[PDB]
Amino acid sequence: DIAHNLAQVRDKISAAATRCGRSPEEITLLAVSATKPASAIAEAIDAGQRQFGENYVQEGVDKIRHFQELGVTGLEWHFIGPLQSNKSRLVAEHFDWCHTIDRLRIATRLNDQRPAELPPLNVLIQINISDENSASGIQLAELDELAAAVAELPRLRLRGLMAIPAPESEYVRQFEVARQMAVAFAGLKTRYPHIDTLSLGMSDDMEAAIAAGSTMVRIGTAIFGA
Ligand SMILES: Cc1ncc(COP(=O)(O)O)c(C=O)c1O
Ligand SMILES: Cc1ncc(COP(=O)(O)O)c(C=O)c1O
């Protein structure tokens, strides 16, 4: 049951924030609906969920248009997959968030292709904090430069950071990797304006990411099936 799983996840988020002294309201739940059918999002929507994440551009845009045409308003769509330049326009025209900015060129394309009547596309810069097997995300030593360049793009808005740590089963390592991300997030927050989003944590490392200071968890399996 999707509705039951939504309520179960929100309780686990709420408990995890409370245990480490944070308000549950600090944590945004991003329902990762990738590869799930639109009918499943429809249940989530009917269960009160508004923020959905997609990894593939055309699947996402098709869903976005599906619910726009039903006249469902109030939804927030996050693109959280890797973004190739030949699909940037669909993202720039349809999505509300993009978590996967790791090169200045993809950000400038999104900026140029974003219609002016839309709000600025909220973007996060993706850090490869701990994955040698991923060709996605930058190193922390490159963050200040990319952030400063992306910060001037007027049709974008730099909101913070995202990372997908290498899979890790040890809670100790989960927390320490997430802390590195929280530390970098806090440093960015000092100088840049409106830095409020640390996209960090999935089903299995939710608690350490919340304890470390994530503001947004990306949950798929625990809501929709694997
Ligand atoms: C499940 C699914 N939906 C949609 C797409 C749409 O492809 P793209 O993201 O390259 O537009 C893909 C393939 O990449 C996919 O695997
Ligand atoms: C960026 C991102 N977040 C979250 C998930 C899925 O999260 P979960 O482990 O709960 O299925 C994936 C999808 O495979 C992902 O690529």
Residue numbers in the entry: 3 to 228
Paper excerpt:
The pyridoxal 5′‐phosphate (PLP) homeostasis protein (PLPHP) is a ubiquitous member of the COG0325 family with apparently no catalytic activity. Here we report a detailed characterization of the Escherichia coli ortholog of PLPHP (YggS) with respect to its PLP binding and transfer properties, stability, and structure. YggS binds PLP very tightly and is able to slowly transfer it to a model PLP‐dependent enzyme, serine hydroxymethyltransferase.
We serendipitously discovered that the K36A variant of YggS, affecting the lysine residue that binds PLP at the active site, is able to bind PLP covalently. This observation led us to recognize that a number of lysine residues, located at the entrance of the active site, can replace Lys36 in its PLP binding role.
